[PDB]
Amino acid sequence: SMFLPPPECPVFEPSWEEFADPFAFIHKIRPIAEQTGICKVRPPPDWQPPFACDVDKLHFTPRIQRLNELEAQTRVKLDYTLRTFGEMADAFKSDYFNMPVHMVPTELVEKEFWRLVSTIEEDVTVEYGADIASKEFGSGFPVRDIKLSPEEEEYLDSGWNLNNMPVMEQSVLAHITADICGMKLPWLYVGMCFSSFCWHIEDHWSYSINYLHWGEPKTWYGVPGYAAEQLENVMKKLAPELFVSQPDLLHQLVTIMNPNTLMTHEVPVYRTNQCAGEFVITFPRAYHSGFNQGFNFAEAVNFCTVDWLPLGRQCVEHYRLLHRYCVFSHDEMICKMASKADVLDVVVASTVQKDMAIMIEDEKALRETVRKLGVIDSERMDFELLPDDERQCVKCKTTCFMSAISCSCKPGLLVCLHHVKELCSCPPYKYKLRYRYTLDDLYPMMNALKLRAE
Ligand SMILES: N#CC[C@@H]1C(=O)Nc2ccccc21
Ligand SMILES: [Mn+2]
Ligand code: NA
Ligand SMILES: [Zn+2]
Ligand SMILES: [Zn+2]
């Protein structure tokens, strides 16, 4: 009645052997965890990264948040000290409940969150921190710089030190030479009671991993990737305003929604309370939302395994259908990796080769179609040199890389090969196919991957 907690998500307690390599571990739990969307990981008892900071010297700009179910909020776009925020946060919780903050049961905060967001007359606003590491507020994990203690040095190269997750070998966002800071760097999150993250999935359907360094728990709700479309259909019926087209990526709309509402509409939802020292991992296209139980500090990062590559391709297709902007070009990433085939991990090479084959066959068919539309002239074009906003399809906003159509009538404008008719009124013989590679360039690149994969 009123609020029924979703079933608990899977919780894993890996041995040190099982834990050592995060990518091997994630691959192992995937058949289980991808059915629930989120899972929790408790590191071995001895894995204990040192956490030290001067709460008076760390400062950040707070964001402010109203807490109303189904109200549109904008996705976080890229002054308190940690001490003064903590004082505010503790006093808020203490005053809200007239209790000391740790004697407030997590069950009660959860119950009260879902009451207050649903109740029109309640007008609770809270503040929180969200940004990438900076000189003003750095990573909670050890980074190289400051003479480090031996304990700190021990965690510098940990696979679970989230600063490393991008630049590692089984990672794929690693190789992106395009600098997508907002997506590949860890985000730092200072939370307070009820501060909340709305239902969302990660850009390009990536994984994410979140570590709670310190503080009171973080309550999560997650939905498996197989039910993403189900969830969106529920959202569109109850909150249509979230689905209107938007000028760019810095304008995405998201919302708070009771998981019981999703469960009523047959969407599977799981929950967990993430405590200090625990990881939460979200899987590709797994919707998630949640809120903080009190003053805390978390760090999170996106990543992409080899398992994810086919889903990445599907995601960009989905973005095209929605006319949504891309964070990066998937094809550019694939070709960058092929161009480095000799130094790729061999399983990575094998998986990239398979995606590349699909890319090449799709590209071959698209080029045949636009030739039949009367586009005859062509010229090589180094798309990777163009700023992203100078190589988006006028129609579907996809980031071009393999090819595009241009016309001297509309200088600087491009369409992708799905939208040749959307560029201008000139007849197609006035158009040029701009292409990064010939088919004859591409097959050798794919062959290099095959040789590396052996
Ligand atoms: N995804 C996710 C959780 C992460 C967090 O731990 N706090 C916060 C606030 C806004 C957006 C995303 C987050
Ligand atoms: Mn997220
Ligand atoms: Na309300
Ligand atoms: Zn297009
Ligand atoms: Zn024209």
Residue 252: what are its φ and ψ, rounded to 5°?
Answer: -60, 140
Tell me how far CA of residue 372 lies from CA of 74, 269, 379, 385, in angstroms: 43, 48, 17, 29
Q: How far apart are CA 256 and CA 200, in angstroms?
A: 10
Tell me how far CA of residue 59 lies from CA of 65, 140, 218, 334, 429, in angstroms: 19, 14, 22, 39, 59
Q: How far apart are CA 27 and CA 240, in angstroms?
A: 36
Instruction: Say which residue the tokens 């590679």 belong to.
Output: 437
Instruction: Say which residue the tokens 């179910």 belong to.
Output: 69
Q: How far apart are CA 33 and CA 270, in angstroms?
A: 11
Q: What is the resolution of this structure in A?
A: 1.8
Q: How far apart are CA 214 and CA 298, in angstroms?
A: 7
Instruction: Say which residue the tokens 């965890």 belong to.
Output: 33
Residue 42: what are its φ and ψ, rounded to 5°?
Answer: -95, 115
Atom of ligand 1 nearest to the CA of 218: 6
How many CB atoms within 10 Å of residue 231?
22
Which pair of structure tokens corresponds to residue 380? 């090589």
Residue range(s) in the chain whose domain bears CATH number 2.60.120.650: 1-326
147-152 contacts: CB < 8 A, separation 24 or more?
Answer: 149/50, 151/50, 152/50
For the domain bounded by 1-326, which CATH number is listed? 2.60.120.650
Q: Are 36 and 222 in contact (CB under 8 A)?
A: yes
For the chain, report the end-to-end CA distance as a whole number of angstroms.
59
Q: In sequence order, what E strands does 262-343 have?
A: 270-274, 279-282, 288-292, 296-303
Helix runs in 55-100, H state only: 82-97
Collapsing DSSP to helix, strand or coil, 448 comes out as helix
State in Å: Cα 224 to ligand 3 middle.
28
Helix runs in 374-438, H state only: none
Which neighbouring-strand residues pair with 406?
Answer: 432
Mutation to probe ligand 1, out of 210, 223, 281 (largest number of atoms < 8 A from CB)? 210
Instruction: Say which residue the tokens 């074009």 belong to.
Output: 381
Q: How far apart are CA 94 and CA 385, in angstroms?
A: 54
What is the DSSP secondary structure assignment for residue 7, as one 8-state letter? P
Q: How far apart are CA 406 and CA 421, in angstroms?
A: 11
Q: Are 328 and 334 in contact (CB under 8 A)?
A: no
By alpha-carbon position, which residue is closest to atom 2 of ligand 1? 197
By alpha-carbon position, which residue is closest to atom 7 of ligand 1? 189
Q: How far apart are CA 159 and CA 255, in angstroms?
A: 33
Helices 346-372 and 439-453, packing angle to 10 deg: 160
Q: How far apart are CA 336 and CA 359, in angstroms?
A: 14
By alpha-carbon position, which residue is closest to atom 8 of ligand 1? 197
User: Residue 305: which of 26, 21, 12 has the closest Cα?
Assistant: 26
Q: How was this structure determined?
A: X-ray
For 91, residues 6+ apart whose C-beta sits below 8 A from its C-beta are: none
State in Å: Cα 295 to ligand 3 middle.
21
Mutation to probe ligand 1, out of 74, 189, 287 (largest number of atoms < 8 A from CB)? 189
Per-residue buried b or exposed e for 76-85, using 16+ beta carbons within 10 Å of the residue's own CB: beeebbbeeb
State in Å: Cα 159 to ligand 4 middle.
38
What is the DSSP secondary structure assignment for residue 325, as one 8-state letter? P
Pairing of strands 63-66, 80-81: unpaired
Q: Which helix (H) or strand (E) holds 42?
A: none
What is the DSSP secondary structure assignment for residue 77, as one 8-state letter? P
Per-residue buried b or exposed e for 248-279, using 16+ beta carbons within 10 Å of the residue's own CB: eeeebbbbbbbbebbeeeebbbbbbbbbbbbb
Q: How far apart are CA 430 and CA 427, in angstroms?
A: 6
Q: Which helix (H) or strand (E) holds 40?
A: strand 38-41
How many CB atoms within 10 Å of residue 396?
18
CA angle 38–41–46, rounded 5-degree value: 170
Q: How far apart are CA 38 and CA 9, in angstroms?
A: 7
